[PDB]
Amino acid sequence: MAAQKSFRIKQKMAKAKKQNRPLPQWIRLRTNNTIRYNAKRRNWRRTKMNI
Amino acid sequence: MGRVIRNQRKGAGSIFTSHTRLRQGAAKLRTLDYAERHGYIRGIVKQIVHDSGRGAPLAKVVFRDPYKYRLREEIFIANEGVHTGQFIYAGKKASLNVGNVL
Amino acid sequence: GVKAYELRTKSKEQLASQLVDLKKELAELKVQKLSRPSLPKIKTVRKSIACVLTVINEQQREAVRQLYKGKKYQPKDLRAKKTRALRRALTKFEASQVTEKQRKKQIAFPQRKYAIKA
Amino acid sequence: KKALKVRTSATFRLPKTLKLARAPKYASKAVPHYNRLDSYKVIEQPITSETAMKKVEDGNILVFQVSMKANKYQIKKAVKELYEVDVLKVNTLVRPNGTKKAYVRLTADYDALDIANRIGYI
Amino acid sequence: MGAYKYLEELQRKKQSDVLRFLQRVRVWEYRQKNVIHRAARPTRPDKARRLGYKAKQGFVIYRVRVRRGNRKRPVPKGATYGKPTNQGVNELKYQRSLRATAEERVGRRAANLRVLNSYWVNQDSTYKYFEVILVDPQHKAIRRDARYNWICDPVHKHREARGLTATGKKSRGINKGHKFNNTKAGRRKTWKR
Amino acid sequence: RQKKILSIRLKVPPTIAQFQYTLDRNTAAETFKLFNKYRPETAAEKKERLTKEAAAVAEGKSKQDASPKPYAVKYGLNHVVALIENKKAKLVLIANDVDPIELVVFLPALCK
RNA sequence: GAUGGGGAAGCUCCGGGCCUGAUUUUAUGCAGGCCACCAUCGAAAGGGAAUCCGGUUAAGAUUCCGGAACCUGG
RNA sequence: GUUCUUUGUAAAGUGCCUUCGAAGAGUCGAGUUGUUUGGGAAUGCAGCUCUAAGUGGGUGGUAAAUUCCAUCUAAAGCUAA
RNA sequence: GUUUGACCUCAAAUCAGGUAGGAGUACCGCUGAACUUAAGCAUAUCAAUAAGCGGAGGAAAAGAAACCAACCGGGAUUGCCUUAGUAACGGCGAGUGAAGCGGCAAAAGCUCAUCUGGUACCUUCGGUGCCCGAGAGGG
């Protein structure tokens, strides 16, 4: 303890951080189409990880 | 027309009720096995404890009489002059003393 | 390599021995971690570990189906047969049973179907 | 005509004051199902880090990556069987990975350094 | 007719006495017993048979109790909020019958079954009593018999909510013919012409 | 209180409400006339042995097409009512203990 | 607030289980005996079984460790 | 198109003879209170109360004698397109 | 006076077998608004709309006359067509608003008032072998 301890919750917030990461060089390179700005990007001060 | 008026607010709702759980109880008078030609209900008052539910005192009486069903105890209503170590008898052939029920 | 056909030809003892080798070999690919590589064997070992489990499950179903054809059985085979509640609802079955008997018989009669019939 | 004394006498012998009996139960017949053996590979990879090595040297302690339906008993049994070492205490940790860090404390009867060498980890 | 006609006859009556004693005593049993009462027997054999009641597996007879009166509508104390035509608590009545509400309640509890059937059988004052036939679709007994076979098909499920039952047809005003009737083919069927 | 030491009817509430009312159902009522009367066991018992022998007497009998009886016994309220109207029945039995009452009700009048 | 019963179509809403004895020490197995107002959840700051000393890490620590102690269950 | 094979019994047509039930009650119908409808004394449905007959009965856009006309048997059910 | 074995009614358990609850877009059964319209408004209108709730299927729902009728004939039920802005309602203001028929799509008339479960046997929508519980008339 603390915080916020609930095991289930903790995992979701942790899981989400990794999911918000930068792209791998390669997908730009084998390439589909996209000036590939991920988008999902989540942010230091700003936005909110989600309510 | 109105907003609801205070009387109508009594109605029900948490703001209206008493805090029923701070109340010790009732203290309704029991219901005789039978007889009671002296002391098949024998109580001794061991204590006098306030009821917040009527702003008056209760007397803790115990009550020891038998069987299976037996029924006994609890907080019957205190009268003036009733005290710890004084006897209570509750029923038909009880003596006519203050605190005795008949 | 491993092909599906080779696993079927193998025995219940033999495939179990395969699953044991496969886990060891996958385990060595764990150790060979420091690099990158090592995987064109793990992706395919993942497929192999799946094939060997499938092939055994399939062998046990078939064997079960043979043993039980003789007797009475079937909650498990029942699930494949319907493929649930709606297709089940479409049954009992209702169809031949419904006109299994009254008043049709009278109605008619056929020397007549033949006689005409060419 | 006037009524019976398991029914009269028993009642003389109560005032309820419960019953009592109990009554039976087989398995019936049409057969149910499930045979399964479904099996997780508890040990997933050895973790490999700089902190892990010092814990190998310093206090004889393996670092494994484990499943998230692992426990401490499962890990103790798993190391014992596959590595023939007997395991004395097991530490289990959530990671922000979404995976489990286990620091597994081993007996001095087989030191952590050459157990480790055959399924290497740094 | 043969046995039944007497029983049926007694039913016509009911201030009236041989039925009337039975029923007056049965009122006592009725008040004690629950909203759900499953019963082995039709207190009705005459009405039940025409009812297609046949003794055979999957068949049940069940007694249901529904309140008598008008309608009361929510939300009292916070009365609406609309012009006087809208307004009604007690003024309004159910369009659906008390019989029909009894069928939906019975079928709700006995999810497994579908109602064939509703017959009315005691009035006391506060309560209305309906004895409902519910029929098992699912089993082979009901199925093997052609006379019953219809109940089983998947379209019929929840017939009482759907209003397909004899009472349901009746409360649509359906019977059966012409002018009286025209918009009974369905309510929504005129489709704001 | 000991002062020996009970019966279930005497003070004790439940097991059941409903049977108790059922017992009440029979004894009380108001009432407009139903049914009562006669059966000491002796008069029953002779009739009861003569009904078992009414079935048991059976031959009736292994050859034919036409082929004379001995016995016919038919049970059930519907069969009984029909056979009275047919005037074939020599003697019927009705049970006192019938509930709902209205099943048996037709026969006492009808048979007379 | 699970939870009779009852309104409301309905959403919605209030108001036997426990302990054994032949066998036998494996627990199988036949057979008997008790008793009142019943569930879970609800405070990481109510209440509560037991641990400290210092040593070490780049980032943990009354958790790991070196010493020493103690508890809980069965 | 080809091929297997049970007896039968009872059903059915045509024609003679009488005859007749499986035919559904708090229903049909009424008032007083509703709401719905194009439905108007005359739509349909709810509720309370009351309440038939048994080949008698219901319908035929107010209600009442008759013969009869003209039509149909509720209070039960299923059902392809 | 007193019990014991058995008959049936109610209850509780139990495991088996069998089915349901929920869901998919709209289509498809009830309870039930308002602004809006009448240049106000209260009947009427919006509207039996929307909503809410219940619930089914691949279509659903309705069906072989206690029908139609205003004659003399038709002959089950939907839908389409048009009957017709007719009848009828209605501050008889504003508005509201059919049916029978005619003929089309497509057609169909029937049906009520030994059964099942268990185990065995097979070529397992079946039946055999057993055991168990429960429109009508005459010649």
Side-chain angles (χ1 to χ4, degrees), chain A, chain B, chain C, chain D, chain E, chain F residues 1-58 60-112:
Chain A
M1 266 65 177
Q4 49 170 226
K5 207 267 329 202
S6 217
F7 355 103
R8 305 139 104 141
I9 323 165
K10 278 229 95 275
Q11 277 161 50
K12 297 190 177 71
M13 287 279 263
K15 301 164 155 184
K17 319 187 295 185
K18 292 244 171 177
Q19 298 175 352
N20 301 317
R21 265 182 188 196
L23 298 148
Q25 278 162 267
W26 317 108
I27 264 60
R28 283 82 168 230
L29 302 166
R30 199 84 301 130
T31 304
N32 315 298
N33 291 312
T34 351
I35 317 177
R36 208 166 236 114
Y37 298 119
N38 295 270
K40 294 201 171 184
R41 289 182 183 174
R42 290 202 172 131
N43 299 322
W44 255 90
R45 311 99 199 204
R46 299 181 191 165
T47 59
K48 292 205 175 171
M49 287 301 302
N50 285 342
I51 301 187
Chain B
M1 330 283 269
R3 269 178 167 289
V4 180
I5 308 177
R6 307 173 193 277
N7 301 2
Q8 288 167 305
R9 303 197 216 94
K10 291 211 166 182
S14 49
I15 357 176
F16 299 98
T17 42
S18 70
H19 313 302
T20 53
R21 313 199 181 204
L22 297 174
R23 311 189 174 193
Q24 282 169 267
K28 293 185 195 196
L29 317 149
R30 228 198 293 101
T31 49
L32 328 188
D33 283 74
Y34 198 53
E36 261 77 54
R37 36 179 182 63
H38 323 289
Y40 305 100
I41 271 169
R42 253 162 187 168
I44 319 185
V45 179
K46 297 181 178 188
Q47 287 181 35
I48 289 177
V49 180
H50 273 289
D51 198 39
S52 66
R54 309 174 177 217
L58 282 153
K60 282 176 170 193
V61 215
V62 168
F63 302 88
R64 310 181 173 182
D65 295 283
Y67 250 92
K68 254 165 171 161
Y69 278 70
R70 313 190 173 165
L71 306 174
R72 304 172 190 175
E73 290 186 66
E74 292 184 291
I75 37 169
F76 294 102
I77 304 158
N79 295 72
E80 291 171 331
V82 170
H83 294 28
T84 86
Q86 300 186 345
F87 265 94
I88 290 195
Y89 310 71
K92 291 165 158 183
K93 273 71 173 155
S95 62
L96 307 153
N97 286 184
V98 158
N100 295 1
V101 189
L102 329 75
Chain C
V2 46
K3 47 189 69 183
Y5 183 49
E6 196 160 11
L7 304 174
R8 191 189 182 208
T9 57
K10 268 188 179 45
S11 284
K12 68 278 184 296
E13 306 175 8
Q14 294 275 89
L15 67 84
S17 187
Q18 287 283 194
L19 176 60
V20 165
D21 278 84
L22 278 163
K23 69 165 184 174
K24 299 165 181 198
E25 182 182 345
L26 177 126
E28 307 295 305
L29 313 167
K30 328 257 77 57
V31 180
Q32 194 159 244
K33 182 172 192 170
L34 224 190
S35 308
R36 276 86 164 288
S38 194
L39 204 89
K41 287 154 292 182
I42 285 194
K43 168 186 77 186
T44 73
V45 158
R46 125 183 332 231
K47 315 196 197 283
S48 303
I49 277 158
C51 292
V52 293
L53 264 51
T54 303
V55 81
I56 192 185
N57 297 335
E58 174 171 65
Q59 179 177 349
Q60 291 182 281
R61 302 163 183 128
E62 177 177 18
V64 162
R65 203 66 163 268
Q66 286 176 254
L67 192 68
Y68 284 172
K69 59 182 49 272
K71 295 287 190 177
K72 185 202 294 308
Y73 58 133
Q74 199 166 17
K76 188 175 170 65
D77 294 311
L78 218 47
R79 306 193 200 248
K81 191 175 161 64
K82 295 162 149 182
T83 313
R84 271 298 287 258
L86 212 121
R87 294 172 158 201
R88 151 184 310 198
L90 198 40
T91 213
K92 285 94 242 168
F93 102 147
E94 64 91 29
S96 301
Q97 305 199 166
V98 188
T99 191
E100 210 159 273
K101 293 190 283 187
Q102 200 68 243
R103 185 166 208 112
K104 189 193 50 55
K105 47 168 75 180
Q106 200 215 329
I107 267 94
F109 294 123
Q111 168 170 265
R112 90 177 60 219
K113 173 210 165 198
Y114 307 123
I116 345 138
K117 147 171 211 285
Chain D
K1 298 166 184 173
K2 304 167 153 187
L4 307 172
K5 273 176 185 182
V6 173
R7 324 160 158 206
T8 24
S9 82
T11 69
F12 256 71
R13 303 159 179 158
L14 302 174
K16 297 87 166 276
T17 63
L18 330 175
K19 198 224 160 192
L20 60 194
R22 273 182 163 141
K25 302 188 202 312
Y26 300 126
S28 223
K29 301 183 181 196
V31 202
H33 48 265
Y34 310 102
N35 303 294
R36 292 179 164 166
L37 288 161
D38 305 71
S39 43
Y40 319 106
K41 313 197 171 180
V42 185
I43 292 177
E44 290 194 286
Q45 274 200 272
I47 282 183
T48 62
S49 61
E50 308 191 4
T51 47
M53 286 287 323
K54 305 183 182 201
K55 291 158 188 164
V56 183
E57 287 182 0
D58 297 333
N60 289 255
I61 316 181
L62 313 181
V63 195
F64 292 118
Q65 301 189 46
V66 204
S67 58
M68 285 300 278
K69 305 188 159 174
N71 289 270
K72 288 173 188 186
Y73 52 12
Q74 300 185 224
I75 299 167
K76 280 195 173 200
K77 285 167 186 213
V79 185
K80 282 170 194 173
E81 309 175 302
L82 302 172
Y83 283 98
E84 313 186 74
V85 204
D86 300 298
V87 164
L88 303 181
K89 267 188 178 179
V90 187
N91 280 336
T92 56
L93 239 169
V94 65
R95 297 186 95 190
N97 303 64
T99 64
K100 199 166 274 184
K101 313 177 210 165
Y103 299 93
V104 183
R105 302 183 258 177
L106 301 173
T107 47
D109 298 349
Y110 285 106
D111 278 4
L113 271 151
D114 309 282
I115 291 157
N117 279 351
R118 302 202 198 189
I119 300 180
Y121 21 105
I122 294 164
Chain E
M1 192 155 17
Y4 309 92
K5 177 187 180 196
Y6 216 84
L7 318 153
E8 188 163 284
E9 189 160 61
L10 262 174
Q11 310 282 342
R12 296 188 209 315
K13 322 190 250 213
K14 184 261 295 202
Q15 285 203 136
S16 293
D17 85 325
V18 186
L19 189 73
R20 180 58 166 191
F21 147 93
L22 227 180
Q23 312 284 314
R24 278 276 88 137
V25 263
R26 271 179 179 289
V27 164
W28 309 20
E29 295 190 297
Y30 295 171
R31 297 186 200 184
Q32 288 178 108
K33 75 182 187 50
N34 319 144
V35 183
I36 162 167
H37 173 253
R38 212 213 73 224
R41 295 292 83 196
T43 321
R44 319 187 63 224
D46 51 281
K47 180 43 59 62
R49 202 162 89 274
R50 18 275 302 152
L51 300 188
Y53 168 51
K54 295 160 75 169
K56 178 164 278 187
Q57 301 193 14
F59 200 92
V60 306
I61 299 85
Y62 188 125
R63 200 185 323 267
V64 46
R65 175 164 128 183
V66 173
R67 65 165 301 267
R68 297 181 51 205
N70 277 349
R71 191 220 168 73
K72 289 80 169 166
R73 175 223 232 66
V75 164
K77 194 90 161 289
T80 66
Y81 301 4
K83 42 185 173 197
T85 193
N86 105 279
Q87 246 244 54
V89 181
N90 269 34
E91 306 296 291
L92 307 164
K93 310 280 190 282
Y94 288 113
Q95 311 111 83
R96 285 234 304 285
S97 308
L98 275 31
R99 188 176 175 198
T101 53
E103 302 197 296
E104 280 184 359
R105 285 168 189 188
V106 170
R108 199 172 308 296
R109 292 169 162 81
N112 179 214
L113 314 185
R114 300 189 203 167
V115 177
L116 228 278
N117 268 309
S118 46
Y119 62 112
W120 251 66
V121 310
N122 253 297
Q123 80 172 308
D124 62 289
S125 27
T126 175
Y127 282 126
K128 216 152 201 74
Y129 295 85
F130 312 79
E131 280 187 274
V132 181
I133 287 88
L134 313 98
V135 203
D136 179 306
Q138 331 105 238
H139 193 266
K140 71 174 75 200
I142 300 104
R143 242 284 129 79
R144 228 271 329 159
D145 180 72
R147 319 302 154 204
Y148 268 179
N149 197 90
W150 51 260
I151 189 63
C152 312
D153 298 292
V155 167
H156 292 247
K157 282 194 178 298
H158 301 70
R159 55 184 295 211
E160 75 286 303
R162 290 175 62 100
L164 272 156
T165 58
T167 188
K169 281 193 286 174
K170 185 176 290 183
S171 67
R172 204 180 295 224
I174 225 152
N175 205 69
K176 165 110 63 267
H178 294 182
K179 222 202 301 184
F180 169 158
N181 212 244
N182 181 84
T183 189
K184 283 45 252 197
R187 186 179 176 150
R188 205 195 183 291
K189 212 74 189 169
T190 170
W191 201 352
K192 183 45 276 205
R193 51 177 197 246
Chain F
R1 289 287 158 67
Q2 203 183 287
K3 171 64 118 164
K4 68 169 197 290
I5 187 182
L6 274 288
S7 27
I8 181 161
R9 297 156 42 248
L10 202 59
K11 230 299 279 58
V12 209
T15 199
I16 196 64
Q18 293 96 77
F19 254 103
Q20 202 139 231
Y21 286 52
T22 311
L23 256 163
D24 307 322
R25 191 195 177 293
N26 313 295
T27 207
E30 171 67 81
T31 185
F32 309 91
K33 346 85 164 166
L34 311 160
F35 179 87
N36 46 341
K37 288 267 271 189
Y38 208 89
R39 187 90 285 172
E41 189 64 61
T42 178
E45 185 68 85
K46 296 300 304 297
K47 181 38 185 170
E48 286 180 288
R49 73 189 64 179
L50 296 166
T51 24
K52 159 55 161 183
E53 310 286 71
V57 72
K61 33 172 54 170
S62 305
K63 296 194 190 178
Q64 270 181 274
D65 171 31
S67 181
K69 303 272 63 277
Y71 148 77
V73 166
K74 299 298 166 283
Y75 60 89
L77 61 122
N78 305 303
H79 296 73
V80 175
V81 69
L83 273 295
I84 293 272
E85 297 197 64
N86 286 111
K87 218 173 192 76
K88 306 303 181 45
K90 297 190 167 292
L91 177 67
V92 297
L93 238 165
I94 286 166
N96 291 178
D97 183 61
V98 175
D99 267 60
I101 299 190
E102 54 181 359
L103 305 170
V104 80
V105 162
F106 33 101
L107 195 51
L110 198 59
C111 59
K112 218 75 145 180

